Nucleic acid binder design. Structure first.
Lengths: 68, 171, 164, 259
RNA sequence: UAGAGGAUCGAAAUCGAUUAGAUACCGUUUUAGUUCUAGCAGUAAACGAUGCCGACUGGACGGGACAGUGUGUGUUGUCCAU
RNA sequence: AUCAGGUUGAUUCUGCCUGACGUGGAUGCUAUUCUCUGGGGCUAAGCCAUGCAUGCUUGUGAACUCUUUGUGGGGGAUUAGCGGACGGCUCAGUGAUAGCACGAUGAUUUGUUUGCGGGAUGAGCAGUAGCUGCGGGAAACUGCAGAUAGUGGUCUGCCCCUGUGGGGGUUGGCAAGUAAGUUGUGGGCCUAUCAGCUGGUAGUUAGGGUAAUGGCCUAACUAGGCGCAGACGGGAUACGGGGGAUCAGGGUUUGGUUCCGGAGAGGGAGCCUGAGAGAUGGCUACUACGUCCAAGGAUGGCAGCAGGCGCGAAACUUGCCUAAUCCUUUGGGGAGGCGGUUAUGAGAAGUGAUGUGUGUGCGAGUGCAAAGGGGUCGCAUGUGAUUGGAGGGCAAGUCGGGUGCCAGCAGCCGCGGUAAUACCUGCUCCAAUAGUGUCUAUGGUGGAUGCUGCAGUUAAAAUGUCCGUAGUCUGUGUAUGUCU
């Protein structure tokens, strides 16, 4: 975390989408929506990747934008 | 520098309810409405009046039915919703405050300009009236009214006509 | 400087003070003026509203009144013999209000000869040594002058037991 | 915030002046002088909103710098000068006279009068003092008058000359008189005294309109303007200060509601 | 914790059995403790797992105390309705 | 004034978890028009290049200048006066010393405004700005000589307190109005793993200081003052109100932000002028960071309007204005107005139609300080839908093809192992529509905090037993007319 220097893990949602990111990339994460608990069968992760270098991850998967 | 504004419509308490989705699809069909926002505008209009009539009957303040009773009966008569009541008899009024509660949402959708250019025969159907109200071809005795939601008045209803300077006119 | 606000005092229950303001010229004060005897010196100070006080730094020649006859005379100030609050103000010859001074007796030479050496014999004994006692009822640091009256009878005996 | 303010925002202007909510952010600030601050209107509004003479402010200051106005028979050239109740405004060219009044809606009102009525003023006596070997009395618009009767006290109404500024005669308050209410809940209403009672250092006047309605008010919000119901000392406005209630206003437009 | 006492039983320790193994159930040798006096401590399925006080409400068969004489007052056990 | 899904082989419960409706902030895809209303508060009361945000009026008339010329004129430097204490920005400090409500000032001062009162044309000496010359210094700033208005002393007179002596002052006033200072009582932020606290501390008597009351300050003396009806402490994202959101009733939550009140100008202190300042687009010192120099010196204050860097998930133009509104009303004004920029909110019209385009473009006139726009006319002209879903909750497909407990989906229950109505891809349909989804905080939902109005044998919960002080209850603080 650039703001506080804490380590966290986050979950990369869609199909085949973990392969756009590289190491030393920047990413925007946000909550899951359930008050600070985990959701579903995912143990220990409380966050969720949203963007990848200022581009929406959901738009790269639907084909509206182009990879970084 | 004025006001922020305010909201005219509301929203249903439950989105997907079939006994409510069946009768709303009729009203936007029979009157040619444009979306559901127009219909919830008119529901709130019609519901303000009922909540106004009930308080006027259970009122112990003896000087209420005179002032505010007949005030709300004049306002309805001006628009063509209620008939004609002798506003001088204490019993002929309190029966008029019992006919305000037995109303429809059709007594309001029918005092509206898109439906008045249809009853007074000037258009094929309610999809043509909207097409030549917006085209500036209707005139309420002097005025080129242009918005198809203008709620006509009783003493101004028969004066509708074409626009004497429009392509549907003589000049 | 001196400032007469009370924002820095402990509260009625004993609680420590909390200050949330700088001092204001509204409530500014002065250091005490200390009027001594000798060679008149008075100064005019400019106060709120543009007005004027007179601050005496040294004074001679009080303006005293003999009560039994009701006449003012101007006498000369000799020394201070009693102050009701601080007797460190007597060792310095400082003239505040209600201090008792020893005054010169010549200008009252006509007045004192309407009293016998009968019930007031202590007023006639000090007159022959050359002095009388008086008391100040003005405020020399606020108006710039000394002004009082001479002690006789009840007063002169009450105070005489103080300064011996 | 220990120094005086010199501006007025327009939201805070008094309701009696009838100023539009928009139309700028500021309003004219009145000056000190004759009447209180909650009981006056600036001179410059009376010449451009209540007479509509000047349409501008370049023009309004051509009418005042050419010396065409006289408040209480005395030339005024300042647009911040304050004008109060029962004051005469004269305009030489196009000879006219007005008196400053209230409505029954409690707004201001300019009432046209004649020329031998424009030599008057009515005020109350409020203070009384002696200085330098002369006895004085103080008006409610703020003036001192010297060498009046020795039998004028606090509360009486006096008539000022307005062209020599000297008392003419007065009125003592008592039953069967007339009243104008200059402030309070009941501002702009004329009545006729019926009873005068007291309370914890107060005097309250039971009154009765010129139509039968009843009434009551302290003695600090009332000026006597008459000796009896047909001996009033000024000319009242068109409606005389009735204030018909809201039951009696719909029957005019709608008739009665009989059983 | 201090003094006194010591029949019986018995943690801990110890052997003999049983068992695949039993540091256990069963048994033999043998202790602290179990008792009294003076104190410390302050816990329990310290349970009817059921605050305290006041007003009103059907039957049947009983018990314990007092007073009367064919019943009453305070307590209390069992069984049937509403 | 409303409920649904989820513990079991099936049942009735207890109990929470999740869905369904609003509102404030940030963010994804997608966008035609106009009208009103908003926009570097949260993190950094962090640091700032350049431009602008404060100057006027004369009963004052220098240099210079004109006239055929004299108690003559032009000219405009400086004196004298008024203002710069308001307006604008921000929310660090402050939990009541501030703010709101009702009171006291008989304890006080007040320029400009209004109406009354009041005013040295005497002597005699000193002497200055501008101006005319000689000059210093990198700079920023400054000296000496010469000669003149206003002016400054001292006598004289005038006024004040006294008088069978004397001693002060140099014209300063009264009443309204406006403003300001001082002061009494009362109010639900959380906390007892905060229970005893207080030395100018509580009072008396005298004096000083102040515009004015008062331990405000000093000298002497008395031993007081507050507290489970919560004192004294400590914590959290504490500026107070007017106000906002939610919504049967009763309640819960929030207010940096237009209007009114306060406080502050990197941090602390101390002051001058003035009717008014403990002033920061005033001065002096210490302290954080600095900047310019010829090295000896001299200097800085955007939480004013634009703008830049930094910080962060997070926020516009280095534009035009001698017009409206007002202050100081042809002087001055980044106050304020006028556009531009941006899915801030709210309202109103469109994306076509058969008899005879609700759009876009241009032209007149209107409008303005100058222009945009808009609405009244004409000329051509013809363009303009998305976002989220289809097993149940919950409106809508056992439709085609791929994948085979993989890849992925799913708030919750759950789906996928070659027989997928739930994943990926194509069609078809559903809801709302210039919008529609996601993350975060909060009201309702919740009789799941219970005053109205819950529960306590066994589901979470009556204390091992008696006695007993404060408090509550019992025994012996109300309603209403009139005025404010």
């Amino acid at each position: 975390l650039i703001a506080t220097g804490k380590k966290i893990t986050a979950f990369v949602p869609y199909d085949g989408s973990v392969t756009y990111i590289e190491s030393n990339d920047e990413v925007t994460v946000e909550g899951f929506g359930k008050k600070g608990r985990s959701v579903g069968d995912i143990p220990g992760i409380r966050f969720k990747v949203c963007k990848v270098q200022n581009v929406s991850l959901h738009a790269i998967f639907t084909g509206k934008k182009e990879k970084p | 520098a004025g006001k922020k504004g305010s909201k005219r419509a509301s929203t249903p308490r439950d989105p997907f309810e079939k006994e409510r989705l069946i009768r709303e699809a009729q009203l936007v069909g029979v009157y040619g409405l444009k979306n559901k926002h127009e219909l919830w505008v008119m529901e709130k209009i019609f519901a303000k009046d009922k909540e106004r009539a009930r308080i006027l009957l259970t009122s112990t303040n003896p000087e209420d039915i005179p002032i505010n009773g007949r005030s709300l009966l004049r306002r309805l008569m001006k628009y063509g919703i209620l008939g004609g009541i002798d506003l001088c008899d204490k019993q002929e009024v309190v029966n008029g405050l019992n006919k305000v509660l037995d109303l429809t949402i059709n007594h309001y959708l029918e005092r509206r300009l898109q439906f008045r250019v249809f009853a007074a025969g000037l258009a094929k159907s309610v999809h043509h009236a909207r097409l030549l109200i917006g085209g500036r071809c209707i005139s309420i005795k002097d005025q080129i009214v242009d918005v198809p939601g203008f709620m006509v008045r009783a003493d101004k209803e028969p004066l509708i006509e074409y626009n004497p300077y429009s392509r549907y006119g003589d000049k | 400087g001196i400032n007469h606000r009370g924002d820095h005092k402990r509260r009625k229950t004993g609680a420590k003070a909390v200050i949330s303001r700088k001092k204001r010229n509204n409530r500014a004060g002065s250091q005490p003026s200390s009027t001594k005897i000798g060679e008149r010196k008075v100064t005019p100070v400019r106060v709120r509203g543009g007005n004027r006080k007179y601050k005496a730094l040294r004074l001679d020649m009080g303006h005293f009144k003999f009560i039994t006859t009701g006449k003012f005379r101007m006498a000369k100030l000799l020394q201070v013999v009693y102050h009701p609050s601080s007797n460190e103000l007597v060792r310095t010859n400082t003239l505040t209000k209600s201090s008792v001074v020893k005054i010169s007796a010549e200008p009252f030479k006509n007045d004192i000869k309407d009293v016998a050496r009968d019930v007031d014999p202590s007023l006639h004994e000090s007159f022959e040594k050359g002095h009388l006692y008086a008391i100040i009822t003005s405020r020399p640091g606020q108006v710039g002058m000394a002004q009082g009256h001479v002690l006789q009878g009840d007063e002169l005996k009450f105070y005489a037991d103080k300064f011996n | 915030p220990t120094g005086h303010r010199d501006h007025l925002k327009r939201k805070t202007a008094p309701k009696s002046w009838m100023l539009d909510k928009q139309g700028g952010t500021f309003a004219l600030m009145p000056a000190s002088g004759p009447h209180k601050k909650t009981e006056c209107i600036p001179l410059g509004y009376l010449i451009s909103r209540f007479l509509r003479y000047a349409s501008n402010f370049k023009e309004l200051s051509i009418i005042l710098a050419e010396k065409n106005i006289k408040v209480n028979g005395r030339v005024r050239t300042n647009s911040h000068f304050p004008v109060g109740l029962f004051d005469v405004v004269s305009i030489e060219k196009t000879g006219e006279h007005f008196r400053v009044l209230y409505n029954v809606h409690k707004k201001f009102h300019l009432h046209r009068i004649s020329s031998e009525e424009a030599s008057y003023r009515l005020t109350k006596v409020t203070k009384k003092y002696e200085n330098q070997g002369i006895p004085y009395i103080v008006s409610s618009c703020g003036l001192s008058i010297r060498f009046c009767d020795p039998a004028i006290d606090l509360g009486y109404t006096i008539k000022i000359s307005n062209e020599t500024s000297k008392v003419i005669e007065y009125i003592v308050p008592g039953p069967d008189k007339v009243i104008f209410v200059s402030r309070g809940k009941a501002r702009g209403r004329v009545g006729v005294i019926n009873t005068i009672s007291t309370q914890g250092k107060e005097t309250v006047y039971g009154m009765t309109d010129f139509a039968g309605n009843t009434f009551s008010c302290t003695s600090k919000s009332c000026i006597l303007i008459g000796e009896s119901s047909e001996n009033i000392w000024i000319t009242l406005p068109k409606e005389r200060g009735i204030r018909q209630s809201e039951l009696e206003k719909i029957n005019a437009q709608l008739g009665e509601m009989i059983d």
